[PDB]
Write an enzyme that holds these catalytic residues in place. Structure first.
Site, PDB file in Angstrom:
ATOM      1  N   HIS A 156      44.211 -41.330   5.587  1.00  0.00           N
ATOM      2  CA  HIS A 156      44.016 -39.970   6.089  1.00  0.00           C
ATOM      3  C   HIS A 156      44.778 -39.817   7.404  1.00  0.00           C
ATOM      4  O   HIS A 156      45.517 -38.855   7.595  1.00  0.00           O
ATOM      5  CB  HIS A 156      42.526 -39.716   6.312  1.00  0.00           C
ATOM      6  CG  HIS A 156      42.212 -38.380   6.916  1.00  0.00           C
ATOM      7  ND1 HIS A 156      41.806 -37.303   6.168  1.00  0.00           N
ATOM      8  CD2 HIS A 156      42.224 -37.968   8.209  1.00  0.00           C
ATOM      9  CE1 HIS A 156      41.575 -36.273   6.973  1.00  0.00           C
ATOM     10  NE2 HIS A 156      41.820 -36.651   8.208  1.00  0.00           N
ATOM     11  N   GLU A 157      44.610 -40.773   8.309  1.00  0.00           N
ATOM     12  CA  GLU A 157      45.312 -40.697   9.583  1.00  0.00           C
ATOM     13  C   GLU A 157      46.816 -40.849   9.401  1.00  0.00           C
ATOM     14  O   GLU A 157      47.592 -40.207  10.103  1.00  0.00           O
ATOM     15  CB  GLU A 157      44.783 -41.757  10.546  1.00  0.00           C
ATOM     16  CG  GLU A 157      43.334 -41.522  10.956  1.00  0.00           C
ATOM     17  CD  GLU A 157      43.074 -40.102  11.448  1.00  0.00           C
ATOM     18  OE1 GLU A 157      43.931 -39.533  12.158  1.00  0.00           O
ATOM     19  OE2 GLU A 157      41.998 -39.551  11.132  1.00  0.00           O
TER      20      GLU A 157
ATOM     21  N   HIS B  93      48.384 -37.592   8.530  1.00  0.00           N
ATOM     22  CA  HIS B  93      48.547 -36.769   9.720  1.00  0.00           C
ATOM     23  C   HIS B  93      49.803 -37.259  10.441  1.00  0.00           C
ATOM     24  O   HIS B  93      50.622 -36.465  10.894  1.00  0.00           O
ATOM     25  CB  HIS B  93      47.363 -36.937  10.685  1.00  0.00           C
ATOM     26  CG  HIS B  93      46.130 -36.174  10.307  1.00  0.00           C
ATOM     27  ND1 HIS B  93      46.133 -34.819  10.051  1.00  0.00           N
ATOM     28  CD2 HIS B  93      44.837 -36.569  10.225  1.00  0.00           C
ATOM     29  CE1 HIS B  93      44.894 -34.411   9.830  1.00  0.00           C
ATOM     30  NE2 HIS B  93      44.090 -35.455   9.931  1.00  0.00           N
TER      31      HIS B  93
ATOM     32  N   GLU C 276      43.658 -30.112   8.822  1.00  0.00           N
ATOM     33  CA  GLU C 276      42.701 -31.006   8.182  1.00  0.00           C
ATOM     34  C   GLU C 276      42.543 -30.682   6.701  1.00  0.00           C
ATOM     35  O   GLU C 276      42.486 -31.586   5.865  1.00  0.00           O
ATOM     36  CB  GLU C 276      41.335 -30.914   8.866  1.00  0.00           C
ATOM     37  CG  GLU C 276      41.294 -31.494  10.260  1.00  0.00           C
ATOM     38  CD  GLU C 276      41.551 -32.990  10.296  1.00  0.00           C
ATOM     39  OE1 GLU C 276      41.546 -33.631   9.223  1.00  0.00           O
ATOM     40  OE2 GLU C 276      41.742 -33.524  11.404  1.00  0.00           O
TER      41      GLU C 276
HETATM   42 ZN   LIG Z   1      41.919 -35.594  10.001  1.00  0.00          ZN
END
Ligand SMILES: [Zn+2]
Lengths: 4, 423
Positions: B223-224, B227, B262
């Site tokens: 997830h990171e 990003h 997000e």
């Molecule tokens: Zn996030």
């Protein structure tokens, strides 16, 4: 970010 | 074949190349910290992050009567060599698990190719690197040498569970949103994970559930990294652009807002909360940004430094942004190629898709409520593997996500704090  | 070709031990002697004491460009000052380069362009710093933000240098937990809901403090975490050794090995194993999937290989490849753009000079006819996209590595002779890098994984700051992607900003350039990109520092820990509930109605309710299932940390890191991918290619969505959640009564009654960045990162149905009009707006915006970079590369002919030649860097960014070159030597952004790259970074690389690749149970939406935080140890193979995570094949944890079931695989999880009811 993981969030709530 | 492995992503990390070395089996680093925290106590391995520094060599000034991939095991070295370094300093980061935080504008503030610090004592050098031991870091490990685990792959081209990627470093790991097994330290709590008291560096990227000068104001967040205190790990001590504030008075109990001043703490919030979803937060966890332990000023001692990651202070010993044993913990740092375990941290390094845990992060390495997660990169391997991610890399072991086709999606992960694709994401990690995009990240390595996503070198922050050289646009820190004033002379538009001169290409220069922005020093905040570098770290200072202490060489064997004790002197400092600047090295460009794309990613750094570092321990969390005071709030242990606040994982996030952060980078140093520019006086004028919005590096993570102008197509340039910047070195990403991910605050993350492989030593804790979060509990969620198997029933959607319970998981999205702040008053129910104790956190029966544990999130696979490989998904959390991915997830990171997603990003980081957006930010390295300078296409992250401004945090002020949010979705005023109107699909969850609990979020609503509290006026909670979730950033589009997000929702995009989670993917699946969440991504649909970003309507077409605004979606087209962003796409066109970044398309222009890529065009500006294409022209800056055309006007640019001279280069600063001697580490790499101009013809090399021009090709480096031609490769990164997948630009086209005409008979003359002018770069341009191809409509089709831009959409493909943009879509790859924003729709192919999503949390929901990684869940499909890892074959794990995971929150079904970003719009839920955390239930708890657990202490874990994924380093021992009897606990977690690159191939199966917690759901070890040929054991009672192989099926029904039994390995992620904290009640069945109780020995692998220690609940540290309950969040349910605290909202
Ligand atoms: Zn996030």
């Amino acid at each position: 970010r993981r969030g709530f | 074949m492995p992503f990390v070709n070395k089996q680093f031990n925290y106590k391995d002697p520094v060599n000034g190349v991939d095991i070295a004491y370094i300093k980061i460009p935080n504008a503030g000052q610090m004592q050098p910290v031991k870091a490990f380069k685990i792959h081209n362009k990627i470093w790991v710093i097994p330290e709590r992050d008291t560096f990227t933000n000068p104001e967040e240098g205190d790990l001590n937990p504030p008075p109990e009567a001043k703490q919030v809901p979803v937060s966890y403090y332990d000023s001692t975490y990651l202070s010993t060599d044993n913990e740092k050794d375990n941290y390094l090995k845990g992060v390495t194993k997660l990169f391997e698990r991610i890399y072991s999937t086709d999606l992960g290989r694709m994401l990690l490849t995009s990240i390595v190719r996503g070198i922050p753009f050289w646009g820190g000079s004033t002379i538009d006819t001169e290409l220069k690197v922005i020093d905040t996209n570098c770290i200072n590595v202490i060489q064997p002779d004790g002197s400092y040498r600047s090295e460009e890098l794309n990613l750094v994984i570092i321990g969390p700051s005071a709030d242990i569970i606040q994982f996030e992607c952060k980078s140093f900003g520019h006086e004028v350039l919005n590096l993570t949103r102008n197509g340039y990109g910047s070195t990403q520092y991910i605050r993350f820990s492989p030593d804790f994970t979060f509990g969620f509930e198997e029933s959607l109605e319970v998981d999205t309710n702040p008053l129910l559930g104790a956190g029966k299932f544990a999130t696979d940390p490989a998904v959390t890191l991915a997830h990171e990294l997603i990003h980081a991918g957006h930010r390295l290619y300078g296409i992250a969505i401004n945090p002020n652009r949010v979705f005023k959640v109107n699909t969850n009564a609990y979020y609503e009654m509290s006026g909670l807002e979730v950033s589009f960045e997000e929702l995009r990162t989670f993917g699946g149905h969440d991504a649909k909360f970003i309507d077409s009009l605004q979606e087209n707006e962003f796409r066109l915006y970044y398309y222009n940004k890529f065009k500006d970079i294409a022209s800056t590369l055309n006007k640019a002919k001279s280069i600063v430094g001697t580490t790499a030649s101009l013809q090399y860097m021009k090709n480096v960014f031609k490769e990164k942004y997948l630009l086209s070159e005409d008979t003359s030597g002018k770069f341009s952004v191809d409509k089709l190629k831009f959409d493909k790259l943009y879509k790859m970074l924003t729709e192919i690389y999503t949390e929901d898709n990684f869940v499909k690749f890892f074959k794990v149970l995971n929150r079904k939406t970003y719009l839920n409520f955390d239930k708890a935080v657990f202490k874990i140890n994924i380093v021992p193979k009897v606990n977690y593997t690159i191939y199966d995570g917690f759901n070890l094949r040929n054991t009672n944890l192989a099926a029904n996500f039994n390995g992620q079931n904290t009640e069945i695989n109780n020995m692998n999880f220690t609940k540290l704090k309950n969040f349910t009811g605290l909202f």
